[PDB]
Symmetry: D2
Subunit: 472 residues, 4 copies
């Protein structure tokens, strides 16, 4: 005998699965009672979340709006078309000159589909080296030659690097490498590079070597939409992005591509037009993905409408101002930030001058409800014990924090890193020994208490703190 639909199918999570419900409620409290500084995290809206958790998950809709493989897509088509049009609008793109595919499941899927669309297996790519600030999917292999990302397996990667002393992209060495290596695709955009990008120079280099130029704006896409950092669309053939970082949406990816007439170029025929659209669509489906996740597409449509608002531009301005204010506070104490500041939403903090690795700082911070991530910095070699920590402003800025509040975050981070150093000095640099200092540490308890009191002062998007199971 089947359970009635009402029993298995309409009963709330809190009754169906108390264990999972409790864990979500614990996670909700964690998110609003600590200081969340992972640069790739944000707190999305309740409206996005209501779309994400909806009947849209039930629909198979392989293909393109209007050109589907299944029937029943009358409304899914309108949702996807709205998502696509709102994506172009959010980035101030003319639909005659740009198209967008909104089906990628996430950022790594989006990049792999973009590469599959324009590259054959083993074709050459150049992206920013991971330890210089680029992403895994920009062709990451280690200095020891170990291929880590599939983008260094299925494609041939030659990363370009920042200058080892200034931390800024070395555009001269980029050009020299591109002319020697002759990549089919040059990738710009990054995960931990704290400066803006000279897309014009990237276009000059790509033209000199005959490469396509792709910007992966995942981290800063919200700043791009708000016209608060350089726009990659002016110069790049393809722009990929996630939607869950500074864009403040669901977890999804998007691939933007040029359409229409190509700009004049020597040797190029008259009336030549871009030919990315069909290849990009085909790479996403049927080549790589299956059914779109329509609940993510619907949720993304909501986020893109929210991103196009006056309030969102103010948010993006505030994100940048908070990151700068945090950076100045840390540098005043003598902490080493890569490039000595930031022009975006994050700072990259080199802990090697302190004799610390990023895992120790991440671990101690976590016990204080300060959420960061350890992060590779130039020249290090251990991913799980790297030389740095990365700090981002988007998530707490979404809770309404301003510059003075980010200065308090700076002080909390100074306390945490100081305490990390004191524990290492007393208990040892070996992780096994360092860990003994994390037990019954009154200063950790004091800092945790201060962090939670501070965090409780701010509102929180995505759910009602007043109705959460675990209150103060």
């Amino acid at each position: 005998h089947m359970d009635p639909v009402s029993v298995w199918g309409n009963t709330p999570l809190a009754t169906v699965d108390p264990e999972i419900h409790d864990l979500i409620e614990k996670e909700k409290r964690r998110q609003c009672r600590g200081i969340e500084l992972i640069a790739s995290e944000n707190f999305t809206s309740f409206a996005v979340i209501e779309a994400l958790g909806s009947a849209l998950t039930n629909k198979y809709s392989e293909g393109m709006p209007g050109n589907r493989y299944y029937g029943g897509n009358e409304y899914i088509d309108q949702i996807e078309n709205l998502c696509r049009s709102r994506a172009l609008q959010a980035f101030h793109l003319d639909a005659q000159s740009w198209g967008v595919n909104v089906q990628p499941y996430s950022g790594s899927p989006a990049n792999f589909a973009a590469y599959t669309a324009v590259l054959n297996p083993h074709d050459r790519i150049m992206g920013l080296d991971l330890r210089s600030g680029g992403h895994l999917t920009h062709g990451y292999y280690t200095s020891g030659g170990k291929k880590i990302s599939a983008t260094s397996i299925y494609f041939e990667s030659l990363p370009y690097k920042v200058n080892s002393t200034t931390g800024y992209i070395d555009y001269d060495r980029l050009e020299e490498k591109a002319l020697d290596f002759r990549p089919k695709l040059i990738i710009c955009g990054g995960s931990a590079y704290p400066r803006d990008w000279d897309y014009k120079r990237f276009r000059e280099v790509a033209d000199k070597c005959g490469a396509l130029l792709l910007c992966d704006m995942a981290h800063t896409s919200g700043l791009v939409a708000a016209q608060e950092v350089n726009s990659p669309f002016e110069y790049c053939d393809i722009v990929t992005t996630t939607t869950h970082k500074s864009l403040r949406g669901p977890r999804a990816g998007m691939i933007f591509y040029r359409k229409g007439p190509k700009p004049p170029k020597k040797g190029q025929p008259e009336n030549a037009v871009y030919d990315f659209e069909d290849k990009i669509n085909f790479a996403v489906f049927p080549s790589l993905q299956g059914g779109p996740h329509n609940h993510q597409i619907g949720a993304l449509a909501v986020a893109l409408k929210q991103a196009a608002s006056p309030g969102f531009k103010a948010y993006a301005k505030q994100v940048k101002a908070n990151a700068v204010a945090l950076g100045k506070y840390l540098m005043g104490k003598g902490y080493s930030l890569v490039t000595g500041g930031t022009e975006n939403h994050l700072v990259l903090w080199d802990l090697r001058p302190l004799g610390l690795t990023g895992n120790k700082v991440e671990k101690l911070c976590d016990l204080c409800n300060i959420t960061v991530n350890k992060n590779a910095v130039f020249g290090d070699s251990s991913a799980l014990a790297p030389g740095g920590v990365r700090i981002g402003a988007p998530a707490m800025t979404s809770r309404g924090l301003v510059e003075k509040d980010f200065e308090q975050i700076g002080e909390f981070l100074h306390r945490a890193v100081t305490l990390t150093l004191e524990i290492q000095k007393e208990h040892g640099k070996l992780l096994k020994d360092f860990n003994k200092g994390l037990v019954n540490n009154k200063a950790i308890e004091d800092l945790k208490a201060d962090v939670e009191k501070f965090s409780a002062l701010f509102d929180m998007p995505g759910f009602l703190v007043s109705e959460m199971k675990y209150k103060d």
Copy 2:
């Protein structure tokens, strides 16, 4: 100035985005008001949907539980661990013999990561030919040599086929092809095959040619969990699946892999153990994916608890009984089913004795709120059949007599497609003139909506929905 958190961040969707809210409400109505027969669709529970739409979407958690690239994962780790443990439980697997990765974003990502874990670029794969019922990701290139799936771009695929007169997998031709082509990986399981799989024979073939054996149980995973079809875990090295078809969960993928001591094989050393776990995990992350989608993982844990219940076992049995009853009704009308029946959740209807392409029947049905999909059949492009599935309408509480009624609605829809064809010709341009102001289409559509609208609907409250008519 920034908008207050409450305004942009706590206001309900209906107010923030009326355009999208309305479209979701129209889609909710559409799901209520049709006969949903796409064999890969289902209607998941409100409990799954509540976990899917939750603050779990905010978290970066790359890595594995207890070994992450980011802080703050104390609760995300517990959710993922519980998801993995419930996945092993739902499939009756011993955790010393099997592990599972629950991070794949969907089914196609799960498969591509499983392949990446065990194969180098250009290594050889064999899977069921798409026109024989296999999936795109099993190495689909057309009969024209057009590489369609990334599986055939980054790897070298050669499909195996069903017997061209019985519709069943031709195991002898599978063996002969495998011994000639020497694949590193043989894939079994499919998207439109209406029978069970002889995994024991697949294992004999894999052992004879030296291949790994992977089953993609995406379509029948719910039936596997309920022990209503053959278990691929008895014989396969790796089992992939989606979680949203017959398993009735969110859209996600899982990769199961053997762990522990290997069975005796000549030439293989003693005390040898499986070495899939680290390669599978690495392929998912950092090789292919980035951050896990924790709201999917949380929602999946919910679906896996639901799948291990006696009610779900009864559901799986009913899915099978409904598929048989529908196939029997259609065959009682003289229609042709591939293999003459079914052993699972679907039927593959051969429209060849009728003169209709799948797209004709599929498009007519869509106008009547009957959602099927055109489907290639063995030896076809231009599909000669339609695929019909029982999971979704079974989840709405339908039983055998209701599926016999679905049979009659389909019999009416194909009869209409024929009458249109006889009146307007077989050429699609000419045929499309029958779908215009056709009172019989309108009459069938009304009968369908009136039949469909009465049934219960999981996932949301019909009493709260914006469009009740």
Copy 3:
């Protein structure tokens, strides 16, 4: 102090290197005093050898005639042009319909260059399975997936097979495999296949699946030139060959390719022309090879003039007649030949009915100065021996002499069975019967007495250092 030019540079080999000179003289004796049945071997002419051993070896001439990367090629260009023109003439080809590159160093270089010209890495190829009679370069991997031939490493191969009942190519199975696997290139021609090829059916299959069709005629090129077997040029896009087997020339390779208007095809524009020439030339050089071996090209031009003569046509006819007569003799002794006969220069002897592996028969024959080679047979340690007529036919042997060869082979196999019955099947045990065996000694002596009678091309027996 530098040696005077005459001392190091003009003194004969016999004085400069007595060690190597003596070994060459011993090898000349060996070629005279045995029955050479390796189907890929021949005895070329002294005229070819004089061109091969000449100052043409000194020249760098990368490029094509009239378009070289080095100066000084006024005469090398005329030699290569003459070689190419004689290659087209020897195979009765219209120079407006066919071109040829004569630079490949040997047969395997010729094939790999042909593949490189028309395929990208990992593109799909089908060729005759090695155990069905195909060549290594047509693709070969092991049951364990070990890729043996470079063709299977750099491209993706799938073999087609002969029918297990008839031993002939199974054309329906070839077609089915090609439609499933969708190769970019189908190779025909082989190394141990004793029948002719239905190139028309290969062309039908290639058209059905959209593949290019290449024939590797290395083994039967001499018979093709003499118009004694089917011409692959009627149906194939590209024809590769060696020049040292039945063509009786130096060791070299040639790649023939279509030129000019393409024949009508659906979905193909009007006035379409072939575009193989530049790709083929580029693949040979600069992609794969360096400087041509002009002594080989000159010697090849000689061999191609010799191949176009009525004497060579008679030779090709005699090769076929000798192989038939030998196959008939062996088959009258009750032995089993793959396909039950031959239509070319070789027979493929199935030893499985006798309980012998090809390696046993080959090793015993070698001890008797009978040179054959163990050879895989369909459905297999190789279970057969391949025996060829070109080399002994070049020494003037006719059918009755090949019947005598058949009796020497019959004696060799009887002895091989008698050794097996006495010492056992294991080659460790079997090898004990080869020590101080007077019956091997007697067969070896009878073989030498038989062989040393006949004439020998390429050198004067009257001048050779070892006459006993």
Copy 4:
């Protein structure tokens, strides 16, 4: 009727094929009546030529000595084993530490077989860029990214370059590129590099990036045998070579490889041994080649015996001395030589300062019986009209010429380039116009006559001038 064996098979070339005989005789006269300066050419001995044109061509001998597929190899095995042993002896190698495969048909086959033995498809290699002096088979693709050599198709190439100002290998940039690109194999040795190689530094770079190190000594192999240039065997894992250049043998290749215990290295197990022999043999056969060319192997055995003589060491010294004397003469005329001199058998002459392309100089020289080749130089782009010409000493040194004779060669070249300039000044630089100036040019005729009178003063190896058909 079959022709008697004597008619078709024993009759001399002069009777069987008068056209080819006549062409060989014209080529023989050309070789001994001009000045032959192609750096990759030599004049081999009559003894080598007698082995090359011999019954050895008739034998199929697939496999390795002892481990053959066919029978009948009693003597071919002794010839091949003698060739291999003499090869090791010629390069002063201990058979316990070095093995050699002598079956490669030429240099390009030898290199591709070495690569196939140790690399999988698409593995990375780094060789000297063609315009810097490396060979096609060292991974040549053009500055425009066009893949030319199959070594850039089947493998992934990133060339290293000479310093743009000095013309010497930039070892610092080699190391930097190798650490970024992470090649599996680094190739040293070259075709037009006029200096010796710092194999020690190459070993240091290879060890730093975990690459194998291969030297292709084709051009200088004869100088290596005579210990007149640095020995690559001291530091390289594998050494490939042709045998027809400075080694003065037939056209063939060899692959030398290390055997036995590996030198100590951190992270390398105890008792570890080299594993090249089987892979290299297998790559040559059955993977790549078919039947060995036993007449080449026999001829090579002769050449290797000759290369181990005291006379050959004096020859190698004279080759270097003649190249230096020629270079001094040309530079004393103000001509531009890459690196301003030579340490081997060649000079590389940059004609761009004169406003000349190398095809013009090559073409005019050819009309004067002066055989050179146009040669790419650093920074040019056209292959059939490049910026330099390459001049080598081996071939005329084999005819007995010494330094004073090579100064006369420099004078002829000075006359030839001067005359090339005059024709360009009169007729212009476009090739169709410049070619008009080569008709009825009295100074060309006079220079050609002088070259021929000079060339006729010297002996000639490989054939008896007294016996040749076309006499003075």
